[PDB]
Each structure stands twice: as C-alpha cells, then as structure tokens.
Amino acid sequence: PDHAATQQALEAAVADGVPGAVAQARDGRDRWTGTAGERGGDDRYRVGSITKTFTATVLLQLQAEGRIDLDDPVEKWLPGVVRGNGHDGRKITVRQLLNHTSGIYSYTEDPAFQAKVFGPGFLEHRYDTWTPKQLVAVAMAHEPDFTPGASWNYSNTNFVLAGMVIEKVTGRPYGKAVENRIIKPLKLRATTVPGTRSAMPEPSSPAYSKLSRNAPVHDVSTLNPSIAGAAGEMISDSRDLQTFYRALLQGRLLPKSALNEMTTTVQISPEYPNVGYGLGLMKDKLSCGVEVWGHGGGIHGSSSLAQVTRDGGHSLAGNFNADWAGDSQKVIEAEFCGTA
Numbered sequence: 001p002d003h004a005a006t007q008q009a010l011e012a013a014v015a016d017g018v019p020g021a022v023a024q025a026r027d028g029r030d031r032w033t034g035t036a037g038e039r040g041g042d043d044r045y046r047v048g049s050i051t052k053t054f055t056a057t058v059l060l061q062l063q064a065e066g067r068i069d070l071d072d073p074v075e076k077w078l079p080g081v082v083r084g085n086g087h088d089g090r091k092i093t094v095r096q097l098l099n100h101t102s103g104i105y106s107y108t109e110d111p112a113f114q115a116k117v118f119g120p121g122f123l124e125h126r127y128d129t130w131t132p133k134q135l136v137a138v139a140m141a142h143e144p145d146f147t148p149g150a151s152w153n154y155s156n157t158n159f160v161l162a163g164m165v166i167e168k169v170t171g172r173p174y175g176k177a178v179e180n181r182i183i184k185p186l187k188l189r190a191t192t193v194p195g196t197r198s199a200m201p202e203p204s205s206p207a208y209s210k211l212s213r214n215a216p217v218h219d220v221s222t223l224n225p226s227i228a229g230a231a232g233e234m235i236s237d238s239r240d241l242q243t244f245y246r247a248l249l250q251g252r253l254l255p256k257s258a259l260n261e262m263t264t265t266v267q268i269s270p271e272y273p274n275v276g277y278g279l280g281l282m283k284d285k286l287s288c289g290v291e292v293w294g295h296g297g298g299i300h301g302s303s304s305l306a307q308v309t310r311d312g313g314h315s316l317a318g319n320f321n322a323d324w325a326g327d328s329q330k331v332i333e334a335e336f337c338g339t340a
C-alpha cells in the first residue's frame with residue numbers, strides 16, 4: 001500500500017517525547033495503520049476540538065431541514081444568554097459562532113477556570129461537572145475580544161453556545177443529535193459522546209500531561225469531559241474519524257448548499273494565507289500543494305489530527321498521548337506530501 005513517511009513521522013513524535021503515537025490513513029482505498037512507542041493501532045482517544053466538526057454538521061443539517069437560519073441572531077435562540085460586559089447576542093449570528101468571528105471570550109482562558117482545569121488544580125477538579133450554562137457564565141464576566149465580524153479568534157465558548165442552540169432547536173441534548181444524525185448512520189462503533197462519564201473505552205493507552213509549561217508528568221486518562229462538551233468532549237479512534245471526515249467532504253451528511261457554507265472560510269492569519277476556518281472545519285494547503293480539510297484536537301493528554309482531501313478520497317487521523325510533545329503537522333505533511 002505504502003505509508004512509510006507517515007510511519008517515520010510517528011517515530012519522530014515518539015523521539016520528541018510522545019509515549020505512544022497512532023495514525024491511520026486511506027489514500028484512495030486500502031486503510032493503513034501505524035504505531036510508534038507504546039500504542040495500539042485501534043486505540044480510542046479523546047478527540048478534543050474535533051468534536052466541533054460534529055457540532056457544526058448537526059447545525060447545518062438543522063438549517064437544511066428549515067429549522068434554523070444560521071444567520072439568525074444568537075439572541076433568537078438563546079435569549080438573554082450572551083449579554084455580559086459588552087457581549088451581545090443580538091449582534092452575533094449562529095454562523096459567527098461556528099467560524100469563530102463572534103468575538104466571544106473563550107471560557108477556557110478565564111484565569112480561575114485555568115487554575116481549576118489546566119494546571120495542577122486539575123488533580124482536584126478533574127471530575128467536576130460543568131453545565132453548558134456554567135461555562136458560558138465564566139465567559140460572560142469578561143469583555144469580548146472584538147466586535148462581531150471584525151476579526152477571528154478561536155473560542156471554545158462559541159461551540160458550547162452552538163450546542164445550546166442545537167438543544168433549543170431539537171428539544172433534546174445536543175449529544176443525542178450527534179448520535180442519531182452521525183454516529184449511528186455512519187456506523188461509528190468506536191465513537192461516543194461521553195457527557196460527564198470519565199472512563200476510557202478499550203482499546204486505549206494512557207494519556208499524559210504536564211498540566212504546565214521540568215514539571216512532573218501526570219496520567220490524565222480519566223476526566224469529566226463536560227469541561228469541553230460540544231466544543232470538545234468526544235471519544236473516537238483513527239478509523240471512525242476518517243469515516244466521518246470522508247463522508248462529510250463527500251457530501252454524504254449535508255446537501256450541496258450546506259457543505260458549501262461549511263467550506264466558506266475565513267482567513268485566520270495574515271502570515272498563513274492558505275489556512276482558512278469555515279464552519280467547525282479548517283482548510284490548509286500543504287507544501288506540495290495538496291489542500292486538506294479537517295480539524296485538530298487538543299484536550300488533556302491528547303493531541304489529535306484528522307484531515308481529508310476536498311473530495312474525501314484521501315484521509316488521515318491520529319493521536320499523540322502527550323500534550324507537550326510531537327508535531328502533528330509533520331504527520332500531515334508526511335502523509336499527504338511524502339515529506340520526510
């Protein structure tokens with residue numbers, strides 16, 4: 001089949017300090033599985049921010065069903081929720097949540113939240129339950145980053161709000177929509193929306209973090225994923241992630257107009273003009289000119305990647321179980337461009 005450069009890139013991650021690296025890929029046809037260090041090829045892992053693509057897909061389906069217009073103000077769906085210290089849901093649309101042009105303060109940057117969740121306080125608070133409204137409240141103490149539409153900044157609050165919109169439209173928790181609209185129809189048997197459940201399914205390797213930037217390493221495998229919810233709670237493997245992104249870019253989950261909206265991107269950096277962020281989905285043009293679509297994931301002890309070409313024909317997904325080491329871009333370049 002032929003994935004030697006990608007195997008090499010997994011080995012480089014492990015040399016950089018990742019205890020165990022895994023990836024799978026499928027170039028046209030014929031799925032390849034690779035591991036380096038201490039890792040299993042079918043390992044399940046916390047996909048972090050990749051969850052956002054699932055959340056966006058549901059909202060695009062709901063729009064296609066005529067149940068919501070993504071250019072609706074957030075206030076229409078979540079009255080009074082986005083109002084704090086300059087935040088104004090009357091002036092922010094659901095679309096602007098999904099492409100991070102809302103300007104809404106990212107709750108994961110709140111200093112008290114960071115002390116509880118991202119530093120050594122994690123050891124005390126890792127199993128605490130955070131409601132979506134509690135996460136939004138954390139953000140609403142603060143001023144927005146910018147006026148709606150004026151810039152771009154990645155904000156986890158945007159996708160917690162998006163989950164809340166899904167719940168308002170459907171009358172059920174957003175996870176049920178992900179399950180019924182995506183996981184079940186695509187037969188994603190290794191993919192779950194754990195809610196507040198902290199355990200990891202099998203097979204899995206441990207997940208490791210320094211909770212810091214010398215510092216000790218912690219086994220962070222178990223945690224209450226409500227810190228992320230619709231912005232990052234899902235668990236999957238490297239096979240299911242490919243199945244999902246291939247189906248998505250192939251148009252199997254969305255009509256043409258909806259996928260077109262999803263792939264309408266904002267330039268997120270002047271220095272990287274070919275990197276764009278659409279609706280819970282990113283594009284990048286690699287060194288060899290191949291354009292990939294997908295999303296990265298970060299959560300405790302878990303750095304995830306998932307990418308596909310635009311027609312969904314060539315896919316890759318994988319994971320590092322250290323959050324302080326390993327270059328995920330090297331794996332992407334190796335797979336799509338053969339870059340050593």
Ligand SMILES: NCCCCCCCCN
Nearest residue numbers: 118211298299300303323
């Ligand atoms: N410092 C605590 C855990 C870090 C949060 C996720 C980081 C993922 C980066 N790959």
